[PDB]
Amino acid sequence: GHQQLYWSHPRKFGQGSRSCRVCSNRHGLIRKYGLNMCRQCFRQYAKDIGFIKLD
Amino acid sequence: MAVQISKKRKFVADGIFKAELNEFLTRELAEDGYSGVEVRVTPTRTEIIILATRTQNVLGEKGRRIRELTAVVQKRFGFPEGSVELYAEKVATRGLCAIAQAESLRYKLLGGLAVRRACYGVLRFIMESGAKGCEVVVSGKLRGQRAKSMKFVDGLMIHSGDPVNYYVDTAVRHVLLRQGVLGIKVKIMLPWDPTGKIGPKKPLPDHVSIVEPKDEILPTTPISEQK
Amino acid sequence: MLMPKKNRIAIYELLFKEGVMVAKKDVHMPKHPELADKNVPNLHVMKAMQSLKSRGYVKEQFAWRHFYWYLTNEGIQYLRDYLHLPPEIVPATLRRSR
Amino acid sequence: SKQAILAAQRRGEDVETSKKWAAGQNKQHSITKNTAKLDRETEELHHDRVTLEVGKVIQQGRQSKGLTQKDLATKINEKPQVIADYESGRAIPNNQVLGKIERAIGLKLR
RNA sequence: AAGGGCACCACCAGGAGUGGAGCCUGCGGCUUAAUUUGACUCAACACGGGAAACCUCACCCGGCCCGGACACGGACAGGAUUGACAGAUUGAUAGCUCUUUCUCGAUUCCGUGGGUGGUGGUGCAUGGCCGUUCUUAGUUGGUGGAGCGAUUUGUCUGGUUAAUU
Ligand SMILES: [Mg+2]
Ligand SMILES: [Mg+2]
Ligand SMILES: [Zn+2]
């Protein structure tokens, strides 16, 4: 509060814009192919996403 | 046609939908023996199959719970109305499922008893359910203030190579006890035999089988049979 | 929370039409995605459903970043008494099909 | 039975005495669920928590006697977190702890 | 100590070097209101995917907000309360305060208990994940044998192999 200065700093581009879609953390974020997961959450969910360690 | 997504992004988004659906459905109906999900996507009304152990309480009273579950799925994932339907199937041989056995161990531990007794009971149930081998690990603040780990291996278990991708199955659970969490890790080696549903086909790569010959009698004096 | 009454009525009736409420956990979102015409921000939905949980009328679950809410039978009775609606109409999840 | 035992002890003896299981000791925390059932059970997979009504009853009874969670927990010889978990609908009920709370606050919880 | 075998994270035969110079970047120190913090032989130091103008952001200097559920009391349609134009005031077009009065309507406000959030502490309370011991060939039951026993044999003199092959 109030309305015209609460969230007024622009969260366009940059690390304050983007966050993990699982844990809402902002660091180590993989945004390739529109994953938008942090690297730890990606390692957790990569097998049932469809990514396999193959070589 | 109007809205388009490249195939890489499309397949990644499909995998992300499967992952989030599986995690939400794990978190929701864990006390019902969830044990995995299947999705059948089609360019029409899709289906999602829930492979529970006890389906009579996954379906609520007159199927109220399955109705509210398909409601929240359709409201979260932005499906159009009627394009998603949600099914339930009872899993056969619940003793061969790592997720169900890890949940059973969590249930026993939360109810409270010796960790030894619970792990022994789960292990022997897994063996007499038909597994080739099992391995149950419990780790955390056991009796004492310093953390230990205890494994209860039995039978047969492979660790390396490509056969351990499809021929065992694992599960990790956390148990929120009174003093920190315990970790549960259950691995079950599946049988091969029927080349059907209870296990996988294509047996272990270093297991050769040699068919036995027949009798092979009468190599004696020549005879000819005409027609 | 302040939440002028028409917003609370809107949130409650939408929870009553189908017995679920699927708001997303972020407070800086100017409209709920599917209310979106009654000028209801996401924060109001979050805090109203939190109050409903505290009285025990609604059970919640939490996915990755989303809230899910289910309306219990005490929730049916309370919403029925709050909306002054007659005691024969039901939410969609209670009965729509065979 | 007392009548049959005193009848047998006034004549030719056939009585049998035997020691109880937990006789002559104080187990401070009595177990709530029978481990014979809990080791046997494989199918049922859920634990019922305390209802919200029970937590509200504890809250109102405790607040009406000038008593806090710390003081109630110290009075019934438990940690404050188990009281705060009973009041918040999170803890699996224990009949022994529930009975201690009933004698502490004078209400009936079962 | 001896006897077998092995490895360019060992050596030999060498190649390209690094260590010297300018600069980039990471650590320590010093300085600072703050120069947030973890990691210190291999197994810390272009590592935390850590290329920070703001955000990130934890740290410093100031200033708003409640996003303090719920329960019980209190006060309350003769008003519980919510916003706000102008002046001052402020870094500020924060009605943040002060003057001034308008506006909203039971949602709030006050007290007690208690929620809730925390890139707050503790990795020497933990889970999971990872690294390392350890890139080598190693490890273990059952039944039998030996030994009072701890233990041992199986798992070996020899030849062979990248390998208890
Ligand atoms: Mg190999
Ligand atoms: Mg060297
Ligand atoms: Zn991820």
XYZ file of C-alpha atoms (C1' of nucleotides) and ligand atoms in Angstrom:
658
model
C 0.000 0.000 0.000
C -0.890 2.345 -1.334
C -1.816 1.390 -4.873
C 0.457 3.685 -6.860
C 3.708 2.664 -5.157
C 3.172 -0.896 -3.884
C 4.455 -3.069 -6.752
C 5.474 -0.111 -8.853
C 9.034 -1.071 -9.761
C 8.715 -2.694 -13.200
C 9.147 -6.477 -13.195
C 9.810 -6.630 -16.887
C 13.140 -8.231 -17.960
C 15.674 -9.600 -15.469
C 15.964 -11.963 -12.557
C 13.195 -10.226 -10.649
C 10.803 -11.238 -13.418
C 11.386 -14.949 -13.652
C 11.093 -17.683 -11.067
C 10.898 -21.454 -10.930
C 7.502 -22.912 -11.722
C 7.897 -25.416 -8.878
C 9.668 -23.675 -6.003
C 9.424 -19.967 -7.017
C 13.188 -19.540 -6.541
C 15.089 -17.207 -8.850
C 18.574 -18.723 -9.193
C 19.862 -21.358 -11.577
C 16.748 -21.075 -13.720
C 16.568 -23.103 -16.932
C 14.470 -21.184 -19.438
C 15.468 -23.234 -22.487
C 12.494 -24.747 -24.367
C 10.234 -22.869 -21.943
C 10.975 -25.154 -19.005
C 11.234 -22.321 -16.450
C 12.471 -24.704 -13.760
C 15.492 -24.270 -11.557
C 18.304 -26.750 -12.090
C 17.619 -28.737 -8.916
C 13.910 -29.103 -9.660
C 14.781 -30.053 -13.229
C 17.089 -32.793 -12.004
C 14.260 -33.995 -9.783
C 11.606 -34.033 -12.525
C 13.670 -34.745 -15.646
C 12.947 -38.474 -15.798
C 9.170 -38.131 -15.905
C 9.303 -35.014 -18.045
C 10.916 -37.187 -20.703
C 14.587 -36.282 -20.490
C 16.801 -39.342 -20.070
C 20.483 -39.613 -19.289
C 21.528 -41.560 -22.350
C 25.204 -40.801 -23.000
C -3.858 -23.608 -36.541
C -4.373 -20.055 -35.273
C -2.202 -20.595 -32.180
C 0.911 -22.647 -32.845
C 3.749 -24.055 -30.759
C 6.968 -25.579 -32.080
C 7.361 -29.320 -31.590
C 10.208 -28.999 -29.088
C 8.212 -26.650 -26.873
C 5.101 -28.771 -27.370
C 6.738 -31.996 -26.189
C 8.441 -30.230 -23.276
C 5.082 -28.754 -22.248
C 3.474 -32.201 -22.444
C 6.149 -33.575 -20.138
C 5.698 -30.656 -17.750
C 1.952 -31.289 -17.651
C 2.586 -34.949 -16.821
C 5.074 -34.028 -14.088
C 2.850 -31.440 -12.405
C -0.218 -33.667 -12.649
C 1.680 -36.596 -11.144
C 3.046 -34.479 -8.309
C -0.318 -32.912 -7.454
C -2.045 -36.268 -7.588
C 0.708 -37.775 -5.431
C 0.309 -34.994 -2.880
C -3.477 -35.261 -2.837
C -4.352 -38.969 -2.750
C -1.239 -40.388 -1.110
C -3.302 -42.068 1.626
C -5.157 -44.020 -1.070
C -2.207 -45.804 -2.671
C -1.790 -43.537 -5.695
C 1.041 -45.383 -7.507
C 1.309 -43.570 -10.818
C -0.791 -42.110 -13.618
C -1.258 -42.430 -17.375
C -2.463 -39.743 -19.777
C -3.958 -40.417 -23.198
C -3.751 -37.190 -25.166
C -5.679 -36.935 -28.422
C -6.918 -34.030 -30.582
C -10.317 -34.384 -28.879
C -11.511 -35.241 -25.354
C -8.538 -36.690 -23.444
C -8.316 -39.309 -20.691
C -6.258 -39.571 -17.519
C -5.995 -42.988 -15.866
C -5.175 -43.183 -12.151
C -3.557 -46.460 -11.101
C -4.595 -46.498 -7.455
C -4.539 -49.465 -5.068
C -7.864 -48.782 -3.333
C -10.181 -47.268 -5.917
C -13.301 -47.355 -3.748
C -12.136 -44.259 -1.855
C -10.411 -42.587 -4.782
C -13.943 -42.493 -6.080
C -15.841 -40.724 -3.334
C -19.474 -41.132 -2.353
C -21.135 -41.829 -5.722
C -17.873 -40.675 -7.290
C -17.793 -37.213 -5.754
C -14.029 -37.171 -5.237
C -13.257 -38.177 -8.822
C -15.657 -35.450 -9.954
C -13.982 -32.711 -7.939
C -10.586 -33.986 -9.095
C -11.534 -33.704 -12.747
C -13.001 -30.286 -11.913
C -9.743 -28.990 -10.439
C -7.744 -30.520 -13.303
C -9.970 -28.848 -15.899
C -9.879 -25.541 -14.015
C -6.105 -25.478 -13.490
C -4.764 -26.789 -16.783
C -7.133 -24.724 -18.907
C -8.876 -27.576 -20.656
C -12.162 -26.718 -22.360
C -15.237 -28.115 -20.665
C -15.838 -31.814 -21.231
C -12.495 -32.337 -22.963
C -10.938 -34.105 -19.964
C -12.227 -37.198 -18.196
C -10.661 -38.952 -15.255
C -10.606 -42.702 -14.671
C -9.453 -45.013 -11.908
C -7.966 -48.493 -12.075
C -7.000 -50.891 -9.323
C -3.370 -51.956 -9.506
C -2.678 -55.676 -9.428
C 0.033 -57.049 -7.110
C 0.337 -54.047 -4.812
C 3.264 -55.817 -3.174
C 5.273 -55.277 -6.350
C 4.758 -51.503 -6.376
C 7.447 -49.443 -4.683
C 5.251 -46.377 -4.130
C 2.509 -48.341 -2.368
C 4.996 -50.208 -0.188
C 6.793 -47.002 0.752
C 3.434 -45.495 1.707
C 2.625 -48.610 3.749
C 5.929 -48.221 5.574
C 5.121 -44.542 6.171
C 1.712 -45.521 7.556
C 3.236 -48.045 9.946
C 5.932 -45.607 11.070
C 3.423 -42.806 11.679
C 1.246 -45.233 13.618
C 4.325 -45.919 15.692
C 6.195 -49.158 16.233
C 9.698 -50.541 15.945
C 11.356 -49.553 12.687
C 12.821 -53.075 12.557
C 9.412 -54.715 12.803
C 7.820 -52.470 10.177
C 10.663 -52.963 7.701
C 10.677 -56.735 8.256
C 6.933 -56.921 7.660
C 7.063 -54.823 4.496
C 10.037 -56.814 3.199
C 8.451 -60.207 3.755
C 5.174 -59.035 2.213
C 7.107 -57.892 -0.862
C 8.835 -61.275 -1.081
C 5.695 -63.355 -0.775
C 3.954 -61.068 -3.262
C 6.366 -62.387 -5.882
C 9.450 -60.183 -6.154
C 12.874 -61.462 -7.128
C 14.398 -59.214 -4.484
C 13.863 -56.143 -2.376
C 15.815 -53.444 -0.597
C 14.372 -51.136 2.060
C 16.456 -48.304 3.509
C 15.381 -46.089 6.405
C 17.547 -43.124 7.325
C 17.305 -40.393 9.896
C 17.044 -39.735 13.605
C 16.299 -43.253 14.783
C 16.634 -44.260 18.444
C 19.207 -41.706 19.561
C 19.962 -38.099 18.634
C 22.483 -38.910 15.879
C 21.225 -40.017 12.497
C 21.825 -43.526 11.187
C 20.824 -45.496 8.127
C 19.504 -49.045 8.101
C 19.017 -51.276 5.090
C 17.000 -54.485 5.028
C 18.105 -56.075 1.748
C 16.862 -59.533 0.802
C 16.932 -61.692 -2.284
C 18.348 -60.474 -5.576
C 19.085 -56.974 -6.820
C 20.983 -55.449 -9.722
C 22.573 -52.033 -9.558
C 24.390 -51.298 -12.797
C 23.844 -51.172 -16.526
C 20.808 -50.581 -18.669
C 18.624 -53.434 -17.220
C 18.202 -51.337 -14.119
C 16.024 -48.824 -15.935
C 12.979 -50.991 -16.466
C 13.505 -54.106 -14.432
C 13.428 -52.613 -10.916
C 11.375 -49.707 -9.617
C 12.131 -47.333 -6.764
C 10.346 -44.875 -4.499
C 11.511 -42.226 -2.037
C 9.257 -40.894 0.704
C 9.711 -38.502 3.616
C 8.078 -39.194 6.988
C 7.410 -36.079 9.070
C 7.981 -37.542 12.518
C 8.189 -35.786 15.888
C 11.950 -35.089 15.620
C 12.956 -34.367 12.041
C 12.161 -36.504 9.035
C 13.036 -40.075 8.171
C 13.810 -41.132 4.616
C 12.308 -44.265 3.085
C 13.820 -45.886 0.010
C 12.242 -49.034 -1.423
C 13.599 -50.906 -4.441
C 11.846 -53.961 -5.884
C 13.342 -56.207 -8.568
C 10.542 -57.458 -10.741
C 10.149 -60.984 -12.120
C 10.378 -61.582 -15.839
C 8.406 -64.737 -16.319
C 5.094 -64.284 -18.183
C 6.315 -61.633 -20.663
C 3.053 -59.936 -19.660
C 1.897 -57.396 -17.088
C 3.389 -58.467 -13.738
C 6.917 -57.778 -14.967
C 8.830 -56.847 -18.103
C 9.627 -58.798 -21.239
C 13.223 -59.040 -22.645
C 14.996 -60.880 -19.797
C 18.330 -59.997 -18.247
C 20.974 -59.771 -20.982
C 23.311 -62.429 -19.590
C 20.620 -65.067 -19.026
C 20.718 -67.570 -21.865
C 18.281 -70.464 -22.062
C 18.907 -73.626 -24.056
C 15.985 -75.723 -25.228
C 16.298 -79.426 -24.613
C 16.414 -81.828 -27.571
C 13.882 -84.520 -28.401
C 14.328 -88.297 -28.231
C 15.756 -88.746 -31.774
C 15.184 -92.482 -32.030
C 15.312 -94.988 -34.934
C 18.483 -94.126 -36.892
C 18.526 -97.794 -37.917
C 18.030 -99.662 -41.254
C 16.407 -97.704 -44.094
C 12.664 -97.719 -44.703
C 10.584 -95.676 -47.143
C 6.969 -94.598 -46.689
C 5.081 -93.820 -49.901
C 1.807 -91.969 -50.443
C -9.138 -8.338 5.242
C -11.186 -5.425 3.872
C -12.627 -7.076 0.735
C -15.824 -5.129 -0.124
C -18.862 -7.336 0.191
C -19.662 -7.836 -3.492
C -16.261 -9.475 -4.001
C -16.920 -11.876 -1.123
C -20.355 -12.721 -2.530
C -18.799 -13.332 -5.956
C -16.061 -15.610 -4.584
C -18.537 -17.548 -2.463
C -21.074 -18.064 -5.240
C -18.366 -19.202 -7.623
C -17.192 -21.690 -5.010
C -20.806 -22.788 -4.742
C -21.512 -23.294 -8.461
C -18.823 -25.966 -8.632
C -17.368 -27.163 -5.379
C -13.755 -26.253 -6.191
C -11.592 -23.133 -6.259
C -8.206 -23.248 -7.955
C -6.511 -19.884 -7.295
C -2.777 -19.447 -7.958
C -0.295 -18.399 -5.268
C 0.783 -14.925 -6.143
C -0.589 -11.807 -4.510
C 0.419 -9.281 -7.180
C -2.133 -10.304 -9.789
C -4.797 -7.699 -10.586
C -7.600 -10.134 -11.422
C -8.415 -13.740 -10.762
C -8.146 -15.396 -14.206
C -11.717 -16.628 -14.337
C -13.600 -14.184 -12.177
C -11.995 -11.442 -14.275
C -15.122 -9.293 -14.726
C -16.258 -8.595 -11.158
C -12.941 -6.844 -10.371
C -11.711 -9.513 -7.951
C -7.932 -9.572 -7.412
C -6.176 -12.821 -6.601
C -5.271 -11.712 -3.067
C -8.944 -11.511 -2.103
C -9.565 -15.066 -3.308
C -6.509 -16.345 -1.422
C -7.443 -14.706 1.876
C -11.158 -15.518 1.651
C -10.410 -19.180 1.042
C -7.883 -19.095 3.884
C -10.634 -17.885 6.216
C -12.872 -20.661 4.896
C -10.139 -23.183 5.708
C -9.700 -21.789 9.210
C -13.364 -22.330 9.972
C -12.996 -25.829 8.520
C -15.482 -25.391 5.681
C -12.880 -25.998 2.946
C -10.025 -28.495 2.588
C -6.970 -27.358 0.656
C -4.068 -28.920 -1.180
C -0.992 -27.258 -2.670
C 0.697 -28.201 -5.953
C 3.856 -26.634 -7.355
C 2.539 -23.065 -7.215
C -1.244 -23.459 -7.124
C -3.867 -23.764 -4.426
C -6.710 -26.234 -4.707
C -9.812 -26.022 -2.569
C -12.668 -28.458 -1.977
C -15.970 -27.556 -0.369
C -16.904 -29.805 2.552
C -20.397 -30.615 3.811
C -20.105 -28.069 6.609
C -19.049 -25.736 3.826
C -22.226 -26.656 1.952
C -24.300 -25.786 5.011
C -22.435 -22.544 5.726
C -22.545 -21.296 2.141
C -26.214 -22.269 1.977
C -26.904 -20.194 5.086
C -24.734 -17.286 3.936
C -26.194 -16.975 0.444
C -29.791 -17.383 1.755
C -30.394 -19.972 -0.963
C -33.038 -22.697 -0.546
C -31.816 -26.068 0.796
C -32.332 -28.130 -2.344
C -29.799 -26.743 -4.838
C -26.347 -28.304 -4.780
C -22.900 -27.608 -6.224
C -21.970 -29.267 -9.493
C -19.603 -31.840 -7.994
C -22.366 -33.199 -5.766
C -24.556 -34.278 -8.704
C -24.432 -33.456 -12.410
C -24.357 -36.872 -14.110
C -25.264 -40.499 -13.452
C -13.744 -63.732 39.438
C -13.553 -62.698 43.100
C -16.399 -64.962 44.226
C -15.004 -68.092 42.571
C -11.433 -67.319 43.681
C -12.435 -66.849 47.322
C -14.600 -69.964 47.015
C -11.632 -71.981 45.764
C -9.270 -70.626 48.426
C -11.482 -71.825 51.310
C -11.029 -75.447 50.176
C -8.790 -77.655 48.001
C -6.602 -75.386 45.918
C -6.712 -75.273 42.129
C -6.114 -71.545 41.570
C -3.507 -70.196 39.157
C -1.697 -66.896 39.643
C 0.328 -65.208 36.919
C 2.167 -61.926 36.513
C 0.749 -59.117 34.390
C 2.641 -57.925 31.323
C 3.588 -54.359 32.303
C 3.481 -54.995 36.048
C 5.751 -53.106 38.415
C 6.972 -50.350 36.101
C 5.985 -46.958 34.719
C 5.851 -46.653 30.954
C 5.603 -42.884 30.608
C 4.193 -42.906 27.067
C 1.549 -45.568 26.525
C 1.173 -46.681 22.914
C -2.092 -45.747 21.231
C -2.474 -48.360 18.475
C -2.061 -52.096 18.919
C 1.136 -53.123 17.164
C -0.321 -56.581 16.531
C -2.798 -54.884 14.203
C -0.263 -52.375 12.919
C 2.300 -55.005 11.907
C -0.411 -57.189 10.366
C -2.131 -54.444 8.361
C -1.158 -53.995 4.711
C -4.288 -52.593 3.082
C -5.568 -49.606 5.043
C -3.272 -46.665 4.620
C -4.557 -43.632 6.550
C -4.491 -42.123 10.039
C -7.365 -39.984 11.266
C -6.248 -36.725 12.844
C -8.002 -34.745 15.562
C -11.109 -32.896 14.456
C -11.324 -29.121 14.370
C -14.072 -29.263 16.998
C -11.694 -30.948 19.459
C -9.060 -28.273 18.916
C -11.663 -25.546 19.382
C -12.827 -27.196 22.614
C -9.247 -27.291 23.921
C -8.731 -23.671 22.831
C -11.875 -22.363 24.529
C -11.413 -24.376 27.713
C -7.779 -23.340 28.059
C -8.458 -19.669 27.296
C -11.270 -19.563 29.882
C -8.888 -20.454 32.724
C -6.108 -17.915 32.133
C -3.870 -20.649 30.827
C -1.436 -20.697 27.908
C -0.117 -23.509 25.737
C 3.175 -23.485 27.649
C 1.434 -23.639 31.019
C -1.020 -26.343 29.937
C 1.801 -28.416 28.449
C 3.910 -28.047 31.591
C 0.887 -28.900 33.744
C 0.203 -32.119 31.822
C 3.949 -32.893 31.448
C 4.185 -32.642 27.668
C 6.100 -30.484 25.224
C 4.335 -27.307 24.028
C 4.400 -28.462 20.404
C 2.123 -31.438 21.032
C -0.456 -29.096 22.586
C -0.103 -26.695 19.668
C -0.515 -29.659 17.316
C -3.623 -30.927 19.100
C -5.183 -27.477 18.885
C -4.337 -27.046 15.191
C -5.820 -30.298 13.876
C -2.454 -31.778 12.960
C -1.596 -34.449 15.517
C -2.773 -38.057 15.602
C -4.892 -38.388 18.773
C -3.580 -40.276 21.788
C -6.230 -41.287 24.315
C -3.823 -41.040 27.246
C -2.782 -37.477 26.357
C -6.417 -36.573 25.652
C -7.410 -37.815 29.099
C -4.680 -35.744 30.713
C -5.986 -32.680 28.861
C -9.548 -33.412 30.048
C -8.442 -33.563 33.674
C -6.416 -30.400 33.096
C -9.204 -28.230 31.649
C -12.305 -29.958 33.013
C -14.003 -30.628 29.675
C -14.851 -33.861 27.870
C -12.969 -34.528 24.642
C -14.165 -38.009 23.661
C 59.947 -54.686 5.805
C 59.825 -58.155 1.848
C 57.383 -60.295 -2.706
C 53.780 -59.891 -6.945
C 50.855 -56.298 -10.177
C 49.022 -51.426 -11.735
C 47.945 -45.591 -13.031
C 50.348 -39.399 -17.959
C 44.827 -36.879 -11.600
C 52.704 -41.403 -11.329
C 57.358 -41.318 -13.591
C 60.365 -41.998 -18.198
C 60.744 -39.970 -23.777
C 58.673 -35.482 -25.135
C 54.780 -31.664 -26.657
C 52.002 -27.501 -25.009
C 52.578 -24.860 -20.965
C 51.458 -22.282 -16.085
C 54.836 -19.692 -12.398
C 57.693 -13.688 -14.970
C 54.424 -8.866 -18.010
C 49.529 -6.021 -19.031
C 44.545 -7.078 -18.307
C 40.022 -10.189 -16.847
C 37.972 -12.868 -12.928
C 37.673 -15.660 -7.960
C 39.763 -15.792 -2.728
C 42.454 -13.430 1.747
C 43.661 -8.843 3.761
C 42.929 -3.632 4.376
C 39.282 0.258 4.213
C 34.007 1.194 4.810
C 27.322 2.912 6.861
C 27.608 -1.575 4.181
C 31.732 -3.493 1.184
C 25.828 -9.789 2.509
C 27.332 -14.876 2.680
C 28.930 -20.407 1.914
C 33.378 -23.387 0.563
C 40.030 -23.581 2.438
C 45.312 -30.041 0.484
C 43.938 -33.570 -3.308
C 38.147 -33.551 -2.169
C 37.855 -24.210 -1.455
C 39.630 -20.077 -4.841
C 35.625 -18.386 -14.011
C 32.706 -22.870 -7.658
C 27.353 -21.799 -5.425
C 25.317 -22.710 -12.952
C 27.366 -16.404 -8.619
C 28.554 -12.430 -16.333
C 24.812 -8.106 -9.082
C 23.404 -0.640 -12.802
C 17.328 -1.341 -10.649
C 15.042 -6.168 -9.476
C 17.913 -10.098 -7.842
C 19.509 -9.023 -2.261
C 20.379 -11.503 2.203
C 24.015 -6.129 3.662
C 23.700 -0.334 4.870
C 20.533 4.492 5.281
C 15.413 6.092 5.290
C 10.115 5.527 4.408
C 4.963 3.120 3.493
C 1.795 -1.788 4.070
C -0.589 -6.098 6.880
C -0.850 -9.831 2.905
C -1.984 -10.343 12.098
C -6.313 -16.767 9.907
C -9.411 -18.186 13.829
C -11.668 -18.277 18.921
C -13.347 -15.311 23.252
C -14.470 -10.634 25.247
C -14.979 -5.006 24.242
C -16.874 -1.058 21.274
C -20.731 -0.486 17.527
C -26.274 1.732 11.945
C -27.371 7.835 17.378
C -21.690 4.566 13.169
C -17.140 -0.693 13.959
C -14.393 1.359 10.301
C -12.200 2.596 4.803
C -10.264 6.098 1.430
C -9.201 11.245 0.163
C -8.697 17.229 -2.757
C -5.835 21.228 -1.146
C -1.926 23.603 1.953
C 2.260 22.452 4.785
C 5.437 17.953 5.361
C 8.462 14.473 2.692
C 13.518 11.835 -1.436
C 8.503 11.147 -3.249
C 1.838 12.647 -6.644
C 3.533 7.562 0.956
C -3.805 11.196 3.309
C 3.034 8.820 6.053
C 1.962 12.652 9.544
C -0.324 17.923 10.877
C -4.714 21.657 9.506
C -9.283 21.050 7.162
C -13.531 18.508 6.682
C -15.951 15.191 2.954
C -16.561 9.918 1.869
C -17.292 4.249 2.889
C -20.622 0.952 5.621
C -20.244 -4.127 9.593
C -15.975 -6.548 5.523
C -13.030 -3.901 9.788
C -10.974 -1.788 14.941
C -9.162 -2.648 20.344
C -7.441 -6.550 24.270
C -6.099 -11.671 25.247
C -4.714 -16.418 23.274
C -2.890 -17.961 18.889
C -1.849 -17.833 13.233
C 1.433 -16.830 9.486
C 5.945 -15.535 6.928
C 11.329 -15.646 7.247
C 17.920 -16.035 1.483
C 16.881 -15.670 10.311
C 20.456 -19.632 13.438
C 22.054 -24.677 13.701
C 24.617 -29.192 7.445
C 27.747 -30.910 14.676
C 19.683 -32.248 15.151
C 17.890 -34.239 9.928
C 15.708 -35.978 4.676
C 16.983 -35.832 -0.349
C 20.775 -34.828 -3.734
C 25.921 -34.567 -4.680
C 31.232 -35.076 -3.936
C 35.028 -38.171 -1.942
C 37.446 -42.479 0.195
C 38.118 -45.391 -4.973
C 38.623 -45.925 -11.329
C 40.741 -49.492 -8.665
C 38.648 -55.016 -8.252
C 36.450 -55.282 -4.548
C 32.134 -57.167 -1.181
C 28.609 -60.886 1.126
C 25.182 -64.741 3.086
C 23.351 -70.262 3.484
C 25.053 -75.227 4.818
C 29.622 -77.832 5.924
C 34.975 -77.746 8.267
C 38.604 -75.247 12.177
C 38.890 -72.361 16.689
C 36.769 -71.548 24.133
C 36.445 -67.042 21.334
C 37.298 -62.524 18.580
C 37.504 -64.694 13.897
C 38.761 -67.880 9.740
C 37.948 -71.244 5.311
C 34.869 -70.676 0.963
C 37.356 -65.602 -1.298
C 43.774 -70.074 -3.154
C 50.245 -72.130 -4.283
C 50.657 -71.454 -9.728
C 49.564 -69.779 -14.959
C 46.432 -66.072 -17.266
C 43.390 -61.440 -17.711
C 41.523 -54.600 -18.118
C 39.178 -57.354 -14.242
C 38.429 -62.581 -7.384
C 38.665 -62.350 -15.764
Mg 29.637 -52.168 -16.973
Mg 50.987 -34.133 -10.062
Zn 12.840 -28.234 -12.292
